[PDB]
Design an enzyme around this catalytic site. Structure first.
Site, PDB file in Angstrom:
ATOM      1  N   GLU A   1     -18.444 -36.356  23.259  1.00 28.40           N
ATOM      2  CA  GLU A   1     -19.371 -35.244  23.200  1.00 28.40           C
ATOM      3  C   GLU A   1     -20.860 -35.577  23.168  1.00 28.40           C
TER       4      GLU A   1
ATOM      5  N   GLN B   1     -12.809 -26.046  16.646  1.00 27.86           N
ATOM      6  CA  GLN B   1     -11.393 -25.693  16.628  1.00 27.86           C
ATOM      7  C   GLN B   1     -10.654 -26.554  17.660  1.00 27.86           C
TER       8      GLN B   1
ATOM      9  N   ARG C   1      -3.713 -22.062  21.451  1.00 27.95           N
ATOM     10  CA  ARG C   1      -4.976 -21.431  21.823  1.00 27.95           C
ATOM     11  C   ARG C   1      -4.860 -20.310  22.853  1.00 27.95           C
TER      12      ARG C   1
HETATM   13  C1  LIG Z   1      -4.181 -19.251  14.825  1.00 23.91           C
HETATM   14  C2  LIG Z   1      -4.592 -20.604  14.250  1.00 23.91           C
HETATM   15  C3  LIG Z   1      -5.100 -20.656  12.864  1.00 23.91           C
HETATM   16  C4  LIG Z   1      -5.515 -21.929  12.267  1.00 23.91           C
HETATM   17  N1  LIG Z   1      -6.011 -21.916  10.942  1.00 23.91           N
HETATM   18  C5  LIG Z   1      -6.446 -23.106  10.320  1.00 23.91           C
HETATM   19  C6  LIG Z   1      -7.003 -23.140   8.939  1.00 23.91           C
HETATM   20  O1  LIG Z   1      -7.121 -22.147   8.238  1.00 23.91           O
HETATM   21  N2  LIG Z   1      -7.426 -24.419   8.423  1.00 23.91           N
HETATM   22  C7  LIG Z   1      -7.322 -25.632   9.188  1.00 23.91           C
HETATM   23  O2  LIG Z   1      -7.710 -26.694   8.684  1.00 23.91           O
HETATM   24  N3  LIG Z   1      -6.809 -25.601  10.458  1.00 23.91           N
HETATM   25  C8  LIG Z   1      -6.372 -24.397  11.057  1.00 23.91           C
HETATM   26  N4  LIG Z   1      -5.849 -24.384  12.416  1.00 23.91           N
HETATM   27  C9  LIG Z   1      -5.811 -25.716  13.074  1.00 23.91           C
HETATM   28  C10 LIG Z   1      -4.332 -26.236  12.924  1.00 23.91           C
HETATM   29  O3  LIG Z   1      -4.083 -26.530  11.551  1.00 23.91           O
HETATM   30  C11 LIG Z   1      -4.136 -27.510  13.809  1.00 23.91           C
HETATM   31  O4  LIG Z   1      -4.902 -28.581  13.247  1.00 23.91           O
HETATM   32  C12 LIG Z   1      -4.597 -27.284  15.285  1.00 23.91           C
HETATM   33  O5  LIG Z   1      -3.875 -26.213  15.878  1.00 23.91           O
HETATM   34  C13 LIG Z   1      -4.352 -28.523  16.111  1.00 23.91           C
HETATM   35  O6  LIG Z   1      -2.866 -28.611  16.323  1.00 23.91           O
HETATM   36  P1  LIG Z   1      -1.796 -29.653  16.222  1.00 23.91           P
HETATM   37  O7  LIG Z   1      -1.704 -30.266  14.895  1.00 23.91           O
HETATM   38  O8  LIG Z   1      -0.508 -29.027  16.587  1.00 23.91           O
HETATM   39  O9  LIG Z   1      -2.230 -30.648  17.317  1.00 23.91           O
HETATM   40  P2  LIG Z   1      -2.605 -32.130  17.567  1.00 23.91           P
HETATM   41  O10 LIG Z   1      -3.479 -32.589  16.406  1.00 23.91           O
HETATM   42  O11 LIG Z   1      -3.235 -32.356  18.897  1.00 23.91           O
HETATM   43  O12 LIG Z   1      -1.229 -32.723  17.491  1.00 23.91           O
HETATM   44  C14 LIG Z   1      -0.107 -32.472  18.487  1.00 23.91           C
HETATM   45  C15 LIG Z   1       1.297 -32.861  17.878  1.00 23.91           C
HETATM   46  O13 LIG Z   1       1.342 -34.206  17.373  1.00 23.91           O
HETATM   47  C16 LIG Z   1       1.542 -33.928  15.964  1.00 23.91           C
HETATM   48  N5  LIG Z   1       0.776 -34.691  15.064  1.00 23.91           N
HETATM   49  C17 LIG Z   1      -0.478 -35.235  15.374  1.00 23.91           C
HETATM   50  N6  LIG Z   1      -0.922 -35.851  14.384  1.00 23.91           N
HETATM   51  C18 LIG Z   1      -0.070 -35.807  13.329  1.00 23.91           C
HETATM   52  C19 LIG Z   1      -0.015 -36.287  11.995  1.00 23.91           C
HETATM   53  N7  LIG Z   1      -1.026 -37.007  11.503  1.00 23.91           N
HETATM   54  N8  LIG Z   1       1.135 -35.985  11.207  1.00 23.91           N
HETATM   55  C20 LIG Z   1       2.207 -35.236  11.695  1.00 23.91           C
HETATM   56  N9  LIG Z   1       2.247 -34.726  12.972  1.00 23.91           N
HETATM   57  C21 LIG Z   1       1.086 -35.029  13.770  1.00 23.91           C
HETATM   58  C22 LIG Z   1       2.541 -32.654  15.896  1.00 23.91           C
HETATM   59  O14 LIG Z   1       3.892 -32.532  16.399  1.00 23.91           O
HETATM   60  C23 LIG Z   1       1.521 -31.861  16.758  1.00 23.91           C
HETATM   61  O15 LIG Z   1       1.916 -30.497  17.091  1.00 23.91           O
HETATM   62  C24 LIG Z   1      -5.430 -23.226  13.050  1.00 23.91           C
HETATM   63  C25 LIG Z   1      -4.910 -23.139  14.439  1.00 23.91           C
HETATM   64  C26 LIG Z   1      -4.501 -21.890  15.047  1.00 23.91           C
HETATM   65  C27 LIG Z   1      -3.993 -21.951  16.487  1.00 23.91           C
HETATM   66  C1  LIG Z   2     -22.593 -44.754  14.842  1.00 27.99           C
HETATM   67  C2  LIG Z   2     -21.594 -43.845  15.536  1.00 27.99           C
HETATM   68  C3  LIG Z   2     -22.017 -43.148  16.752  1.00 27.99           C
HETATM   69  C4  LIG Z   2     -21.100 -42.252  17.458  1.00 27.99           C
HETATM   70  N1  LIG Z   2     -21.573 -41.595  18.609  1.00 27.99           N
HETATM   71  C5  LIG Z   2     -20.745 -40.699  19.321  1.00 27.99           C
HETATM   72  C6  LIG Z   2     -21.206 -39.966  20.528  1.00 27.99           C
HETATM   73  O1  LIG Z   2     -22.337 -40.085  20.997  1.00 27.99           O
HETATM   74  N2  LIG Z   2     -20.268 -39.074  21.159  1.00 27.99           N
HETATM   75  C7  LIG Z   2     -18.943 -38.876  20.675  1.00 27.99           C
HETATM   76  O2  LIG Z   2     -18.201 -38.095  21.273  1.00 27.99           O
HETATM   77  N3  LIG Z   2     -18.513 -39.544  19.567  1.00 27.99           N
HETATM   78  C8  LIG Z   2     -19.355 -40.445  18.867  1.00 27.99           C
HETATM   79  N4  LIG Z   2     -18.886 -41.139  17.678  1.00 27.99           N
HETATM   80  C9  LIG Z   2     -17.483 -40.823  17.300  1.00 27.99           C
HETATM   81  C10 LIG Z   2     -16.609 -41.994  17.871  1.00 27.99           C
HETATM   82  O3  LIG Z   2     -16.612 -41.926  19.297  1.00 27.99           O
HETATM   83  C11 LIG Z   2     -15.160 -41.867  17.302  1.00 27.99           C
HETATM   84  O4  LIG Z   2     -14.563 -40.642  17.771  1.00 27.99           O
HETATM   85  C12 LIG Z   2     -15.156 -41.855  15.737  1.00 27.99           C
HETATM   86  O5  LIG Z   2     -15.766 -43.040  15.210  1.00 27.99           O
HETATM   87  C13 LIG Z   2     -13.730 -41.778  15.219  1.00 27.99           C
HETATM   88  O6  LIG Z   2     -13.147 -43.152  15.373  1.00 27.99           O
HETATM   89  P1  LIG Z   2     -11.889 -43.799  15.876  1.00 27.99           P
HETATM   90  O7  LIG Z   2     -11.577 -43.474  17.256  1.00 27.99           O
HETATM   91  O8  LIG Z   2     -12.054 -45.264  15.701  1.00 27.99           O
HETATM   92  O9  LIG Z   2     -10.839 -43.246  14.891  1.00 27.99           O
HETATM   93  P2  LIG Z   2      -9.505 -42.452  14.824  1.00 27.99           P
HETATM   94  O10 LIG Z   2      -9.632 -41.286  15.795  1.00 27.99           O
HETATM   95  O11 LIG Z   2      -9.166 -42.035  13.446  1.00 27.99           O
HETATM   96  O12 LIG Z   2      -8.558 -43.507  15.328  1.00 27.99           O
HETATM   97  C14 LIG Z   2      -8.209 -44.808  14.596  1.00 27.99           C
HETATM   98  C15 LIG Z   2      -7.597 -45.875  15.583  1.00 27.99           C
HETATM   99  O13 LIG Z   2      -6.466 -45.371  16.317  1.00 27.99           O
HETATM  100  C16 LIG Z   2      -7.009 -45.411  17.672  1.00 27.99           C
HETATM  101  N5  LIG Z   2      -6.738 -44.307  18.490  1.00 27.99           N
HETATM  102  C17 LIG Z   2      -6.534 -43.004  18.009  1.00 27.99           C
HETATM  103  N6  LIG Z   2      -6.317 -42.232  18.970  1.00 27.99           N
HETATM  104  C18 LIG Z   2      -6.347 -42.884  20.162  1.00 27.99           C
HETATM  105  C19 LIG Z   2      -6.186 -42.578  21.548  1.00 27.99           C
HETATM  106  N7  LIG Z   2      -5.928 -41.323  21.929  1.00 27.99           N
HETATM  107  N8  LIG Z   2      -6.308 -43.636  22.500  1.00 27.99           N
HETATM  108  C20 LIG Z   2      -6.578 -44.956  22.125  1.00 27.99           C
HETATM  109  N9  LIG Z   2      -6.751 -45.353  20.810  1.00 27.99           N
HETATM  110  C21 LIG Z   2      -6.629 -44.290  19.849  1.00 27.99           C
HETATM  111  C22 LIG Z   2      -7.902 -46.744  17.757  1.00 27.99           C
HETATM  112  O14 LIG Z   2      -7.466 -48.119  17.631  1.00 27.99           O
HETATM  113  C23 LIG Z   2      -8.727 -46.224  16.530  1.00 27.99           C
HETATM  114  O15 LIG Z   2      -9.795 -47.101  16.066  1.00 27.99           O
HETATM  115  C24 LIG Z   2     -19.683 -42.017  16.952  1.00 27.99           C
HETATM  116  C25 LIG Z   2     -19.285 -42.745  15.720  1.00 27.99           C
HETATM  117  C26 LIG Z   2     -20.184 -43.632  15.014  1.00 27.99           C
HETATM  118  C27 LIG Z   2     -19.648 -44.315  13.756  1.00 27.99           C
HETATM  119  O1  LIG Z   3      -8.174 -20.310  14.652  1.00 29.69           O
HETATM  120  C1  LIG Z   3      -8.519 -21.336  14.065  1.00 29.69           C
HETATM  121  N1  LIG Z   3      -8.615 -22.566  14.790  1.00 29.69           N
HETATM  122  C2  LIG Z   3      -8.979 -23.857  14.305  1.00 29.69           C
HETATM  123  O2  LIG Z   3      -9.004 -24.838  15.053  1.00 29.69           O
HETATM  124  N2  LIG Z   3      -9.312 -23.879  12.872  1.00 29.69           N
HETATM  125  C3  LIG Z   3      -9.736 -25.148  12.164  1.00 29.69           C
HETATM  126  C4  LIG Z   3     -11.168 -25.290  12.835  1.00 29.69           C
HETATM  127  C5  LIG Z   3     -12.047 -25.833  11.637  1.00 29.69           C
HETATM  128  O3  LIG Z   3     -11.831 -27.236  11.483  1.00 29.69           O
HETATM  129  C6  LIG Z   3     -11.529 -25.155  10.358  1.00 29.69           C
HETATM  130  C7  LIG Z   3     -12.154 -23.738  10.089  1.00 29.69           C
HETATM  131  O4  LIG Z   3     -12.382 -23.015  11.334  1.00 29.69           O
HETATM  132  P1  LIG Z   3     -12.994 -21.575  11.488  1.00 29.69           P
HETATM  133  O5  LIG Z   3     -14.255 -21.418  10.738  1.00 29.69           O
HETATM  134  O6  LIG Z   3     -13.240 -21.375  12.936  1.00 29.69           O
HETATM  135  O7  LIG Z   3     -12.032 -20.584  11.014  1.00 29.69           O
HETATM  136  O8  LIG Z   3     -10.064 -25.053  10.692  1.00 29.69           O
HETATM  137  C8  LIG Z   3      -9.203 -22.635  12.140  1.00 29.69           C
HETATM  138  C9  LIG Z   3      -8.829 -21.433  12.639  1.00 29.69           C
HETATM  139 BR1  LIG Z   3      -8.627 -19.830  11.591  1.00 29.69          BR
END
Ligand SMILES: Cc1cc2nc3c(=O)[nH]c(=O)nc-3n(C[C@H](O)[C@H](O)[C@H](O)COP(=O)(O)OP(=O)(O)OC[C@H]3O[C@@H](n4cnc5c(N)ncnc54)[C@H](O)[C@@H]3O)c2cc1C
Ligand SMILES: Cc1cc2nc3c(=O)[nH]c(=O)nc-3n(C[C@H](O)[C@H](O)[C@H](O)COP(=O)(O)OP(=O)(O)OC[C@H]3O[C@@H](n4cnc5c(N)ncnc54)[C@H](O)[C@@H]3O)c2cc1C
Ligand SMILES: O=c1[nH]c(=O)n([C@H]2C[C@H](O)[C@@H](COP(=O)(O)O)O2)cc1Br
Ligand SMILES: Cc1cc2nc3c(=O)[nH]c(=O)nc-3n(C[C@H](O)[C@H](O)[C@H](O)COP(=O)(O)OP(=O)(O)OC[C@H]3O[C@@H](n4cnc5c(N)ncnc54)[C@H](O)[C@@H]3O)c2cc1C
Ligand SMILES: Cc1cc2nc3c(=O)[nH]c(=O)nc-3n(C[C@H](O)[C@H](O)[C@H](O)COP(=O)(O)OP(=O)(O)OC[C@H]3O[C@@H](n4cnc5c(N)ncnc54)[C@H](O)[C@@H]3O)c2cc1C
Ligand SMILES: O=c1[nH]c(=O)n([C@H]2C[C@H](O)[C@@H](COP(=O)(O)O)O2)cc1Br
Ligand SMILES: O=c1[nH]c(=O)n([C@H]2C[C@H](O)[C@@H](COP(=O)(O)O)O2)cc1Br
Ligand SMILES: O=c1[nH]c(=O)n([C@H]2C[C@H](O)[C@@H](COP(=O)(O)O)O2)cc1Br
Lengths: 217, 216, 215, 216
Positions: free
Chosen positions: A83, A72, A171
């Site tokens: 991680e 989550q 959260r």
């Molecule tokens: C009570 C609760 C229930 C939930 N239930 C579900 C569920 O059923 N299924 C599920 O899949 N997830 C679920 N989630 C996860 C939820 O959908 C979000 O993915 C999660 O809270 C991470 O939040 P975020 O998108 O705001 O944050 P982040 O991914 O960290 O993003 C922070 C901000 O940047 C934004 N942002 C980042 N990336 C994008 C993008 N690509 N496009 C547009 N805006 C962007 C928005 O303004 C966002 O608030 C739940 C979360 C909570 C707290």
């Molecule tokens: C073979 C393999 C081994 C791996 N081992 C580990 C492991 O031991 N531990 C672990 O935690 N993960 C591991 N990963 C996950 C890896 O660290 C990345 O999180 C994963 O590949 C998602 O990739 P990404 O960051 O390129 O992509 P996305 O998150 O989708 O991002 C796409 C692009 O936007 C960028 N970007 C997005 N967000 C940010 C940011 N906040 N700051 C700077 N640039 C950003 C970069 O240019 C990136 O390539 C592994 C992946 C692979 C394929």
């Molecule tokens: O409270 C929540 N928080 C969260 O981050 N998810 C995201 C986590 C996971 O990627 C998928 C399903 O999570 P759960 O099995 O924990 O509900 O949606 C869902 C719920 Br409900």
């Protein structure tokens, strides 16, 4: 700064860059300005929706948590994560066993104590099977698939103040699963200790959650 | 604490930093349930990460810069989305008489009809007139957000920039390169310089196994 | 579908992926799941802050706007952009000249219609100096630095419904500069046509701006 | 378009915006000519100009094991929506590796026994989960005893650029075999919708090692 969460978890502050003044500093450039006044700017920005200045404050945490909790947590894309790997490392016998108090408020056919007991039994059999598979030469990436979601994992989390606040909104709230709520409270405590002005301003003007207004720090 | 002067009145100033080379080492080690070790081993991991393309660990290194540059440079700069910005507002504050005037040497290599000095002269003139018109409108009650629309693209602006090491390296690949405009290149060299000072191992490894540009 | 903005600008829809049901489908894949039930789910998601489902609706716009407008627009990082290059191509004689009604409500020492003139004069002298330099042999990337901020540029903008709503919250608002407010109004209009349910629900439960609540 | 993966998983194309021409239109900033258009796609790919491909967007419906989804969800530049274990009653669907999955690895027990060992523990876990739910234990708590091989479903919306990064990292031998299979499926669909971009990608930018060895 390390805080214990659940039975074997924790939230630890590894590093921090900037403080409340970092946000004040950033905000000032808009009016060709630099750094009691600064404290008032934080409130202004917070209540008016100027969130960007808080992006210049950054934290790095070391977290120990159950995978169902991590899954989550990792849904928060605006942050960086690193991680422990189940493919590379031999996982240790560490799982989240809810205390009987966790079922407080629910009526169940079997005693809370029994529920706790059954989770342990499953965890125990699962881990044994895991070790037996590995001992037999089964690749770690395959052997680990039998491990339950309450298995503890570890990761670093670098996130800025604005994203961390979005994290607390979602959260540090009653709608989120209790387990991650506990982690969010620890995150809030640390956030409050490093950026007290931003934190106070956040609770009073922008925090959308419900628990941080009832539970101290 | 670092300050590098760019162009005639610009600059790149390091305001803050979180972490160092070991911050990436730490983040990376956790995948194997390990932590830090000796310098030889830790420095070996950094290059290892760079080599194999594991860049996430470098995201745990963050920089905060204070930049003064002309708007045409800033425009290209703000195209880098994986970062945070806060900039001087032309809507809210009265802008200062500060513009980037290219030196005659900027035209080196290019054969021009009129001497380079003249090109420099003509640029300063247009800039001067535009600014006077701006001041004129401001002083006659015209809203600042409207009056500034006459100001040229070489007007200097200021902003804060917080970006992590990974995004920063992507910045250097694209901006620390001859294909990018000379002006932005100069700022990229200053950025690289500071990156080098703060994260020696990461930088060196970057230059040897990942850097795709040509000027570094 | 195209909407003209300011004196020579515009906003046109290039393409779109999905509709209100795209968000409905994304969300239903949560509970392992008709009109009334669906539109109600949308109002439910909007009202409780469940915004992620709206990320599955995406638009691509083709925009013609002054750079000072574009500098503000490009600050919205959660989206994709591709703009015309001032260093690659010769820039055309197109600038934003405010109408006298732009100074409306303001008390100025110079008649509004005179301000309009001064802006045109600068534009004209700057552009001519620009062509003078280029014909003289100065590279485009250098000659253009004398052009004013009201110079029109064009770009493609791909963004999802969620980020688009954040955009409308901040730009379709009186605190934003009027010029961009006009573009946001056009963006809102197109968004309304393609996702009426999502749009309706947005205004009612999440929209934080003020002008869409009155226009 | 729906492709079966593993024993119960799949990758299904839900929607798509644009095609190869969308990247072309974006790069040129206008609005045809295969020669020039395709040549441009390749030019963009060869020199690193990747932003134009962000204007091509896909929405996938995926069914995969949590341990696979957890790796997948690490790709932050995308949009997700997954089934909830806190809200929905989980179905009896787990990924049970077949003996062939262990071909090549020397084990002290027959590969088929490993399959049985995994199947048995999965069975026990699910049975305890059901008993917990039946007795009144909240879903969000009862599901914590479920194994990492529990299947989950989600919607994935990603643009071509981010998807290409996904292929680099996942359609590669270093990634776990299970997610490689999904990446192949992702690649097929991508290839089907954007043949020009995919070919250009494989030819100039792709860093993985399986797409140049396995058809589509
Ligand atoms: C009570 C609760 C229930 C939930 N239930 C579900 C569920 O059923 N299924 C599920 O899949 N997830 C679920 N989630 C996860 C939820 O959908 C979000 O993915 C999660 O809270 C991470 O939040 P975020 O998108 O705001 O944050 P982040 O991914 O960290 O993003 C922070 C901000 O940047 C934004 N942002 C980042 N990336 C994008 C993008 N690509 N496009 C547009 N805006 C962007 C928005 O303004 C966002 O608030 C739940 C979360 C909570 C707290
Ligand atoms: C073979 C393999 C081994 C791996 N081992 C580990 C492991 O031991 N531990 C672990 O935690 N993960 C591991 N990963 C996950 C890896 O660290 C990345 O999180 C994963 O590949 C998602 O990739 P990404 O960051 O390129 O992509 P996305 O998150 O989708 O991002 C796409 C692009 O936007 C960028 N970007 C997005 N967000 C940010 C940011 N906040 N700051 C700077 N640039 C950003 C970069 O240019 C990136 O390539 C592994 C992946 C692979 C394929
Ligand atoms: O409270 C929540 N928080 C969260 O981050 N998810 C995201 C986590 C996971 O990627 C998928 C399903 O999570 P759960 O099995 O924990 O509900 O949606 C869902 C719920 Br409900
Ligand atoms: C020589 C040169 C010529 C250029 N010419 C033009 C031109 O003619 N027109 C024009 O408009 N721009 C042009 N640009 C700008 C260019 O298109 C990029 O916008 C700029 O380099 C910023 O880079 P970025 O996307 O890599 O970085 P960031 O936006 O900071 O992103 C860093 C990483 O995260 C990623 N990422 C971030 N957001 C997304 C997303 N939404 N989808 C998928 N991946 C994402 C990628 O892996 C990326 O490399 C040019 C740049 C250079 C260096
Ligand atoms: C009236 C008004 C006045 C303004 N004044 C100024 C000024 O003086 N100076 C100035 O520099 N800018 C100013 N801005 C620009 C403003 O600071 C934002 O950059 C702009 O609104 C784009 O918004 P955004 O960050 O919400 O959106 P996007 O960049 O598109 O991001 C959308 C969401 O994802 C998020 N997000 C994206 N990236 C990050 C990140 N790196 N860290 C944390 N969260 C992130 C947030 O939840 C955000 O709302 C002003 C805007 C308005 C409307
Ligand atoms: O080298 C470049 N760098 C850059 O960031 N752009 C982006 C900047 C701006 O948003 C638009 C047009 O820029 P120029 O006028 O500087 O070319 O495309 C373009 C080029 Br070429
Ligand atoms: O309303 C605003 N909108 C905006 O996007 N900015 C960003 C745009 C630019 O990057 C810098 C200064 O903009 P102005 O000169 O337009 O104020 O901050 C500022 C203001 Br005020
Ligand atoms: O190949 C990999 N892919 C991946 O996405 N991770 C991320 C997934 C998860 O967040 C954490 C641990 O993953 P594994 O247990 O699958 O190794 O690091 C790790 C490895 Br190795």
């Amino acid at each position: 700064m390390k805080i214990d969460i659940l039975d074997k978890g924790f939230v630890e502050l590894v590093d921090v860059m900037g403080n409340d003044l970092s946000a004040v500093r950033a905000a000032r450039v808009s009016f060709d300005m630099g750094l009691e006044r600064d404290r008032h700017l934080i409130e202004y920005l917070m209540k008016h929706g100027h969130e960007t200045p808080f992006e210049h404050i950054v934290f790095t945490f070391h977290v120990k948590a159950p995978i169902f909790v991590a899954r989550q947590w990792f849904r928060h894309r605006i942050a960086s994560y690193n991680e422990l790997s189940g493919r590379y490392s031999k996982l240790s016998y560490e799982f989240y066993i809810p205390s009987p108090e966790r079922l407080e408020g629910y009526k169940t056919t079997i005693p809370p104590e029994r529920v706790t007991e059954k989770i342990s039994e499953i965890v125990d059999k699962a881990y044994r099977t895991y070790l037996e598979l590995i001992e037999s030469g089964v690749p770690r990436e395959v052997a680990r698939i039998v491990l339950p979601l309450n298995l503890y994992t570890r990761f670093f989390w670098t996130v800025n103040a604005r994203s961390l606040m979005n994290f607390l909104n979602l959260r540090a709230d009653s709608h989120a699963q209790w387990e991650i709520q506990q982690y969010a409270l620890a995150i809030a405590r640390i956030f409050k200790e490093k950026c007290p002005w931003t934190f106070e301003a956040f609770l009073k003007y922008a925090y959308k959650g419900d628990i941080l207004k009832e539970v101290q720090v």
